[PDB]
Amino acid sequence: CVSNLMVCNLAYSGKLEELKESILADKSLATRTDQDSRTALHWACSAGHTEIVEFLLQLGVPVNDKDDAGWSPLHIAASAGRDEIVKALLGKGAQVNAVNQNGCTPLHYAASKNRHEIAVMLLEGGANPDAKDHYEATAMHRAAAKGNLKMIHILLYYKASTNIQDTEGNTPLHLACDEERVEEAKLLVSQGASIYIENKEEKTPLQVAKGGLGLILKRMVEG
C-alpha cells in the first residue's frame, strides 16, 4: 500500500485491468501525482510491471517527471533492474542524462546495482559516462568500489574516464584498492588509471592498497 492515490497502488500491485478501468472513468488519473509527486508510471516502473508501463506510454503520458526525491521513471527502472521498461522508456524519449536531487544519473544506479544490460542501453542511448554527482563521483567510482569487473569493462568501452576525482580526492582506482578489489584495480591500471594521483589525504592508490596489491599495480606500470 505504497501511495495515497489508488491508481498508484494499482500500478504497484500490477492490477492492469482495474488500472484501465479507473482511467476510462477519469482520464486525468493517469497523470495525477501522489504525495511523493509520483504517478502510476513511476510505481509501475518500481515494481517492474512492463505491460502497465507500456500501456501508460501509449496513452501519451509524460515520461520524464521527477518525484519528490528527483527520480525520473528511468532512474527508478534502471535502479530496480527493469531491462524492458528501460528499453521502452528510452524508446519513448526518456531523458538519459537526467539528474536526481543527489546529482545521480540513471547510469550511476545501473553501475552501482550491477545492471549490465541497462548500462549498455543508457550509454548506447547517449548517457555521459563521466557524469559526476554532488560528491563528484562517477559510475566508475561506484563500479570500482563494489567490485563490478564486467561493469568496468562496459564503462571503459564507452570511454569513461578512470582518473576523475571525488570530493575526497579519490579516483576509482583509490576506491578499488581500498575495498581490496584486485582484478578491478588491475583492469583500471591497464587502461591508464594513475597510480600517482593523491587524494585530499595525500595518499596514492598504492598507499591505500593492502596485501601488496600496490606492488602488483606498481610493477604493471613501472616494469
Crossing angle for the helix pair 213-222 and 182-190, to the nearest 10 degrees = 20
Burial (CB < 10 A; 0-12, 13-18, 19+), residue 17, is exposed
User: If you compute the radius of gyration of the chain from its CA atoms, what whole number of angstroms results?
Assistant: 20
Handedness of CA 139, 144, 150, 155 (dihedral sign): positive
List all residues 6 or more positions away from 190 whose beta carbon is below 8 Å from its beta carbon.
220
List all residues 6 or more positions away from 142 whose beta carbon is below 8 Å from its beta carbon.
108, 111, 112, 148
Query: Residue 64 phi/psi, 5° resolution?
Result: -110, 10
d(CA 132, CA 9): 34
d(CA 38, CA 125): 25
Quoted resolution (Å): 2.8
The CB density around residue 24, as the number of other CB atoms within 10 Å, is: 8
Angle at CA of residue 85, ends 72 and 155, nearest 5°:
75
d(CA 129, CA 122): 9
For the chain, counts of helices (H) and of strands (E): 14, 0
| Amino acid sitting at position 163 | N
Helix (H) or strand (E) holding 190: helix 182-190
Burial (CB < 10 A; 0-12, 13-18, 19+), residue 105, is buried
d(CA 58, CA 163): 42
Residue whose grid cell is 576506491: 175
d(CA 6, CA 68): 18
Angle at CA of residue 86, ends 188 and 117, nearest 5°:
35
Residue whose grid cell is 584486485: 182
List all residues 6 or more positions away from 117 whose beta carbon is below 8 Å from its beta carbon.
83
- Please report the domains of the chain, with CATH numbers, ordered by start residue: 1-223 (1.25.40.20)
d(CA 34, CA 14): 17
Q: Are 119 and 104 in contact (CB under 8 A)?
A: no
The CB density around residue 83, as the number of other CB atoms within 10 Å, is: 15
Method of determination is X-ray
